[PDB]
């Protein structure tokens with residue numbers, strides 16, 4: 001688990017995301033799609049996006065970024081007491097969307113990257129550590145659900 005100090009860092013960082021949820025959301029998704037094009041193929045509604053200019057100009061991609069980060073923010077604010085919130089997410093992503101756990105690693109790394117990119121010099125070593133732990137926790141709790149399902 002994360003310490004009290006660590007959770008506070010996590011939710012302090014998250015303050016940055018909340019000031020522009022859609023912008024953070026869109027950049028996370030573009031980072032994931034451009035770095036890992038296989039991920040784009042899991043989204044029938046975004047596989048028409050051939051170029052980053054197209055991604056950037058997509059209002060629906062931004063809308064989805066908002067849905068994504070809002071769901072993640074909800075989970076983070078539970079400070080690890082997220083079973084009710086995380087279970088349905090785990091299950092829709094395995095069973096419906098067929099998302100390998102690797103893709104959840106990719107988006108975790110994309111969040112850390114976007115935070116440095118939007119907030120250079122304002123995402124300290126301690127904040128990065130805390131946020132990384134929170135994201136691993138999220139990822140690991142999802143992985144336990146995936147194992148239950150025998151997915152991947």
Ligand code: COH
Nearest residue numbers: 039042043045067068071072089092093097099103104107
């Ligand atoms: C590589 C693709 C992948 C990743 C890493 C990912 C990672 C994450 C993630 C990690 C931070 C969070 C909090 C969410 C949260 C959500 N995702 Co995804 N999702 C992904 C692919 C999808 C797909 C595909 C859908 C359906 C999109 C649609 O057509 O509306 C989706 C839908 C959702 C929805 C709508 C409800 C539902 O269908 O469950 C939420 C909320 N999610 N997702």
